[model samples]
Target: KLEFMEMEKEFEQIDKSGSWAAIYQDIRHEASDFPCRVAKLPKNKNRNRYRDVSPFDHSRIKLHQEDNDYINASLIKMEEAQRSYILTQGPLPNTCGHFWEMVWEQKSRGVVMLNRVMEKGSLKCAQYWPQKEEKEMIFEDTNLKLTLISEDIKSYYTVRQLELENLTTQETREILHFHYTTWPDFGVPESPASFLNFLFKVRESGSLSPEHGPVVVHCSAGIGRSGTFCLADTCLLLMDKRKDPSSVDIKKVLLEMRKFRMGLIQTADQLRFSYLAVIEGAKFIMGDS
Candidate 1:
C-alpha cells in the first residue's frame, strides 16, 4: 500500500496546490520543444487539423510510396509496456484516401476514433467510412476501399468491423473501428468507470497487442484525447507488468510520449484524470478494491 500511496500523494500534492493550471503550464514550458519543420511546408500545411499542433519529423510516420508520404500522424513506441500507437488527426476530406493507405502501409489493426463527426456545432472530422446503409467507400488515390462489416453500439463507445481493400492489388484486410462517442472535447468522460470500460473493450480484442502494427488513435486534433487515450493504456500496461506499479511515473511517461507527438494531455484536468483513472484501473484489474 505504501508504494501506491506515494503516487497518490503526488496527485494529492498537485491537486491540493490550488494552482493546477500554473503547474501544468510549468511542465509544458519545461518539456523542451522539437523541430516540426515538415508541418511548416506549404504543401504539408493543409494536412494538419489544428494550427500549432504538428508532429515532429523525427517520429512522424512516412508513407511507403514515394509520392504519397506524409500524413499528419506520429508513430509512438514504448518498449517498456510493449505499447505502440500511431496518433493521427481525424482524416480531412481530402486526406481520407491517404488515411486508409497508411493503414495499408503500417498494417495497423484499424482506427480508434475518440471524437465524433461534429462537436460544438462544427465539423471536427470528415465521414471517411461508410454508414451501415452505404455499406462501403472507395478511395481512388489509394485504390483502397472500406467496407462496413459489423457494428456494436454501447452506452459510451461503439465498435465497428471494417474491411479495408486494396482494389489495385486485390488485397484485403479487416480493420476495427473503436469509437468513443460520449467523451467531450477538452473534457474527461462521464466517469472513470465508463472510460475504463471502453478501454478494456478495446483491450479484450487484442487490438492493443504487439502482433499488429501501432493502433491508430485519433480525435479531431489528435492531441488532447488521442494523446490521453494512448497514455492511459500505456501506464496501465506498465502497471500490469511491474511488480511495483507505483514505480511508473505518470509525468515522466507523459513527457516522454510528448516527445513523439506534441502537447499530449493538453490540460491540467486531463493530467489529473489520467492519474485518477489509472489508480482506479489498477485496483479494478488487480481486484484490490
Candidate 2:
C-alpha cells in the first residue's frame, strides 16, 4: 500500500521591517529508508523580495562509458532532472551522471556538449576525436565558445570512446566546463578558497546568463561538498547584502536554505560552526583584492 499526505508544520517566521524577512521550518522525516531529508520552501509567489528563488539547486549529474543503452536512458533521466525533483541516487553502481557534464547541461536544457563542426546547410560529417591534436571535446562549434571551468577523470579512457559514445550537442557548450583537481576533502573548510574561486569565476563568466538556469555543483552524493558549497555561498551573499558582518542573522538564511534543499545543513556541528567558514570565505576574497 502507498499513502501520501502533507506532514505537520514546524516553522518560525522572523519579523523585520524594511523588506527583511526570514522563516524556519522543521518537518519530521518519514522516509527513513531513503538517503534524503526533505523540507517545503516558503511561498513568495505574490510578493517581491530578496532571493526570490531557493539557494540550493539539485540534479543527478550522470556520465559514464559502460554501454550505449544505459547511457541513453541516463541522458533521458538527466533531461527529466532539470524539470522536476531530481531523484537522489548515487555512489557508482546505482546512480547515473557526471560531475562536470551534467551540471552544465541540466541548467534548464540550455546546456550542451559538442565535438564537431556540423553544418545544417551541407551534408558534411563532423567528427569528435579527443586526441587528434584537439584538446577540447566540448565547445560551441559555431564560435568555439567554451566553458571557463571544468573537471576531468584523467587518462583512463582513450580517444575512441569519446568519438563514438560521449559526443554531445551544440547546446551543452554554453554552460559546462571541465577540470581535474586532487583536492582531499570536497566539503571541508580546507578547500573553501578553491570552491570560492570556482564560484567567483562562474559568477563573473555567467553574469549575463539567463534567469532560469543556476550554477550546479555536485560531488558523489550531491550532499556533502555540494551542500557545503551552497550554504557557504549563501551565507556570504547574505552578509554582502546586509553590510553588517558581525550583526548578520545566520538563522534567517539557514531556514531559507532548509526550505529550498530539505536538509541543507543537516548536521548540528555543521549548522553551528559554518559561520566561521563564511567569515573566512569573505575575508579570503576581500584580502585577495
Candidate 3:
C-alpha cells in the first residue's frame, strides 16, 4: 500500500546532503545578495513578498470597492454578443458599485463567474473572491450563482479581474475546479490534489485540445497558480507516457519547468507538495504495489 503523509506544517528527510546541500548553500548565498541585485529593482524581478509585485508579462489585479462591497477592477465590459473576452487593465472606474454590477450582470447573462484573486493570507485566510454585500441583489438566480457571507464588514474593498474566453462551442456543464488553499501571497505553494482533479476533468470533458488552444488559468496575478497548474499537468502527462514507469519524481519535472518558468514552484511548501502529489498518487496511478 502507498503510504500517505499527513499535511504537516513541516517536512522530514529533505535531501540536505550531497548535491542538494551544495545547491541549497548557493541559493542561500544568492538570496543574501538579492537586495543588492537591484538598482531600482532589476527588470527580472520576482514577485517579492517584501516588494516586487509584477511577474514578467503578468500584472497585479487591483480591487476597487464601493460602500461595503468589494469588486474586482479587472472586469471589462462584455462586448455585445461578439464572443470575445477581455481581461481588465485599468484606471479605476468613475462610479460606485460598478464592480458588483458587472459580476451580477455577467452571471445573469449566462457568463460563468471565475474568481482569480488568491488572498491566501487575508483576514479570512483563503475565502472565495467576489465578496458579498447586503445592498445589491440585482442579478437573477442569485442563490445558484453565489452564496453571500458578511464576516469581514470592512466597508469598501477591491480586487482585479483576469479573464479568458471559453471558445468551446458549448458551455461547460461540470468543471473540475482546482484550488490550493495553502498558497502564500507572494510565492507559490503546493497546489492541492484538487488541482489535478480539475485538469483531468478538463481533459476528460473533451472541451480543450492543445492543438487548438490552451486552458485559461489565473490567481491574484496570472503567474503562480497558472505556472504550478501547468507544471502539475505536465507531470501527470509525462507519468502517463511510460510503459514501465518508475516512481514519479516531481522534483525532476520541476527542475525542467524552471528552465522555462523561473521559480516555477517558488516556495518550499509548493515544492514539497509537488513531490508529495506524485508520491501520493503513485500507487493509484501505477495500480497497486
Candidate 4:
C-alpha cells in the first residue's frame, strides 16, 4: 500500500513538478518477481530481439502441440478484470512461424503491432504479416497461414482484418491487427485524443475479453511501447469500474502489471506519457468537461 490520494490532483501536482522520473523510480521493484530461466536456454537465445530481453520462466508461452517450442512471449493475465495480453518481442524471422503458432494455440483474436519493421535505420520487427501485395503467407515451419483480408489506414494507425488458418485443422479465424503507426522509439503518441481513439477501436473489437484468450501485443522488445500500451488501457479500465475514479492508483496498477513482465515503461518519458494519457482519458471515462 503506497500513498493513496485523490487521483486527479495527484497527477496535476506531478504535472506541475515535471518530475515523473521520481515517481517512476519509486514504483519499480515495489511489486516484482520471477526469473528468465527458459529465456536464457541455449536454443531459446535466438528467439529474442535483444539478448537482454526475455520472458520470465513461469509466464513465458510454451507451445503445447510441439517440441522444442520456446518462443519469447509472456502471458499477462489480469484475472480480476477478465482480460489478458501476450507481451512479446517483435518476432524474429525464424520465430515468425512460432509467433503465429502462439497466436493460434493461445486462441488470441487480435495482434496489436506498435513498431514498424524498420526503425532508426535498423530492423525493429519482422514483416510478420503479409503486405497488401502478397495477400497470403504460409509459415512452412509451423502449421499456420495468414491472409491479408483488408486494411483501413488512418493518419497514425492501421486497422487490418486478417485471416489466420491452422493448416492441420483446416480452420480459419478472423484476427484484428491494430497497428499504431507513428509511435517513435521509446517515445509517446502525438496526442491523447488520437491515442484514445485507437485504444477505443481495439477495445470495441471484443477480442481482448478473457474468453478470447490473451490479445497478442508486441513492439521491438515488448517492454517499452507494448507495456505502455497495456498500462494505459488497464488503468483506464480500472477507473471505469470504480464509482470514485479518483481512488484508482495508476502507479499501483502498473506495479501489478510489472509483476507479470519485466521492464514495462522502459523510460521515464513513457511513464510520463502514460500519466498524460490516463489523465486525458479519464476525463472521458468520468464525463468531465
| TM-score, ranked from best to worst | 1, 4, 2, 3
Q: In candidate 3, what are the lDDT values of residues 3-44, reduced to their tens digit?
A: 334221122446432244444344323431112222124431
- Judged by TM-score relative to the true structure, which candidate is superior, 1 or 3? 1
Question: For candidate 2, lDDT tens digit of each residue in 1-289?
Answer: 0100110011111111211221212321321121111111333121111121122223212333333111111111112112121212121211122323333434432222111223342211123223332454443221222322333333311112122122454343333322213222223433445445554544455421445445443333334334454566566665555545544445655544444343444343344335546765666555554
Q: How much is 132 displaced in model 3, in angstroms?
A: 12
- Which structure is stronger by TM-score: 1 or 2? 1
The TM-score values for the models, in the order shown, are 0.94, 0.43, 0.42, 0.93
Q: Runs in model 2 with CA error above 4 Å?
A: 1-172, 178-187, 207-212, 266-273, 284-289
lDDT of 3 at 140: 29
The TM-score between candidate 3 and the true structure equals: 0.42
Look at candidate 2 and tell me the lDDT of residue 98: 33
Tens digits of per-residue lDDT, candidate 4, 147-261, equal 9999999998999999999998999999999999988878888778888889989989987886787899998899899999999898788767776666767678888888788
Q: lDDT (CA) for every model shown?
A: 0.85, 0.33, 0.34, 0.84
TM-score, candidate 4, is 0.93
Error of 3 at 1 (Å): 9.3
User: What lDDT score goes with residue 141 in model 3?
Assistant: 16
- Compute the lDDT for candidate 4: 0.84
Number of backbone collisions per candidate: 0, 19, 8, 0
